[PDB]
Amino acid sequence: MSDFLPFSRPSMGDAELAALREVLQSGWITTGPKNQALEEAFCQLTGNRHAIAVSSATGGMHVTLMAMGIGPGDEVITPSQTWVSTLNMICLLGATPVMIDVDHDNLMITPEAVEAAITSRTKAIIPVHYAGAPADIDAIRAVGERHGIPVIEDAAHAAGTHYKGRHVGWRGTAIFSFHAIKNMTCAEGGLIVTDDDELASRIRSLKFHGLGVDPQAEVITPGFKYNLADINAALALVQLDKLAQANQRRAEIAQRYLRELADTPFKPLTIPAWDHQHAWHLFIIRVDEAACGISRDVLMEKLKAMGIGTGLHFRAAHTQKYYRERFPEVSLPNTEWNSARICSIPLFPDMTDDDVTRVITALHQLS
Amino acid sequence: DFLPFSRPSMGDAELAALREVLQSGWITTGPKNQALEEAFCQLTGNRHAIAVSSATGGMHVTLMAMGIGPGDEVITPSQTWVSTLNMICLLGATPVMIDVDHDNLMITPEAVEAAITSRTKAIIPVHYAGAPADIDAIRAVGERHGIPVIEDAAHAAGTHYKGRHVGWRGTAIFSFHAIKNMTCAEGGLIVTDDDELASRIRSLKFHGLGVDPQAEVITPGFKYNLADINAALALVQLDKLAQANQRRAEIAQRYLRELADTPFKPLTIPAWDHQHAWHLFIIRVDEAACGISRDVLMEKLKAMGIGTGLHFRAAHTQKYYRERFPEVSLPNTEWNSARICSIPLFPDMTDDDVTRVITALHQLS
Ligand SMILES: *Cc1c(COP(=O)(O)O)cnc(C)c1O
Ligand SMILES: *Cc1c(COP(=O)(O)O)cnc(C)c1O
Which InterPro entries does the UniProt entry name for this protein (chain A) (predicted)? Predict the structure, then answer.
């Protein structure tokens, strides 16, 4: 399978291996100075005040919602059109996810859909910056502010995303991911930025056993273990140093897909009208059987037979067994239409121009 | 020139394993995880091995997979790391803290039996400092009452009990944290002989995904999977474990011999047949006997360039547990928790490093 083109691969090379050598030689391999440097780097990148490195964005979401006091009786507004981690963490704190629909062409929640779903129980709103584009975060924030409801941003796809001239997470609270397919990776990892001093203090304690000072450190309240090792933080620092060039190459690839699929029936997501810089984490197409003459599932299967990988980001959460059975009344037409028709085609900066031509040619052949 | 109480043994073999993973492009959970799990089944003899992001997370998902929650009691020492107590509480269950033997810091079958109620749903013995608890006797109490025994084997990679590796049967959780005898900086691994428990754990450490067709959320789960970068490090460290533990044993034997004529008191070696992994070398520091307190000894050792650790400040004496469970009174735990410290023990210590520690302790007596 040496000729298989996956939909993503990391850009790991000599720089990463040299950073690893440095940490190994130091003998300080779990959380330490590389974590501190990564956190400082994300404060400089975003402009926000506090950065907390964690073992995954999922764990980051877990401890952020926990630190806010989210629990039984509370509602959290979220798309269904996202990764299931967020819905799972809401449920596992005992709270209730309130799933709302998304815009049919950029797959992100709207301020109107948020406002319609607010109740006296709502304790957080979690927009997703999808595929590398930002949600209309000022408008969503304005809805939250009017009701006194915090907005927690799922920025997994948004390392390098700008919104109205600032990096995502420049204010408010946002959670980044360093999973293997993310634009910067340390295999598994994540990072929370926030402007809220008390929230940051609670998060730092709750990702490391609830330890704090009452004197020596001791458990103040039970917490979890979601700290990031320095081996991983060192990889993340290298990948952050590479991120601008990685995203530039991703944008060049995505622009070519936009142009050369314009005269095919496959339908990319639409670029938001608000000012932004897209990180191009994923290149998603909608495959409508009536327009394309091929279904999404069959397209993925035939691409695979041609040696071309694809991903499904995402099967809507409310269509999956647990949520389907717990929340059977949830009906989200834009989500359901897209979830059945989307796939992610290869997009990663180590792709060659000929890799891109191979994908485009296969899509023209399969139309 | 500082001699810490622990340092990992990382070199070219670890760097070469990392190189291989990076070159493959498959950096999170994958074939190295599979190989690590198979290697732990070969090491222990047990059937299922599930690699996880930390032993804490492993404890979280193991108790969750057993159905532990509100209304359930879990018997545990207070004399352990706070992670276990925290995970019990954060599942909504109730920790029932019991005392430990005053000289090896492990729970006894009698103490377990005395704490059992109709609400008890698990017993969690700790294999402490590299020695095994009397696990057959504790298991027998559990079996008589129908209560599962989940073993905290963080300290016990390489520990044998009656000729088998810890975790050869039953359920046990290992840690690969930086100070453990084999490390991948952070990581852990669950072994179990229970097919259904293993199936649930595997799903619950990766988002609750399972097959009802394609995988989907069957019930919400957590994210505690181990990356292949880390699994590859764990494999190298497992290949080194026997030699690492042999060197630890040589150092520990020299401490036992050359501290015999000091008032510092090591833990006692259990009477049941075992092989000690020598994760920690713990001494008790009684001011009446030693002329110096535990805290002052740690401070003066640090001033001499010698690090020490405290494994552990008993959980029930820490703010949350002291205020939530003020009634807990555990005399052997309290006596030892105020008097123990861990002196340097790791396989990269040279003979001169060990002599430095012994010399300082004789000087400070
Ligand atoms: C995968 C992902 C997450 C979780 O990130 P991890 O770092 O893998 O835990 C959260 N939100 C979205 C939208 C994701 O794609
Ligand atoms: C530290 C430790 C744990 C937890 O292990 P992690 O890998 O750090 O999560 C559990 N039990 C004992 C006895 C420990 O020392």
Answer: ArnB_NH2Trfase, DegT/StrS_aminotransferase, PyrdxlP-dep_Trfase, PyrdxlP-dep_Trfase_major, PyrdxlP-dep_Trfase_small
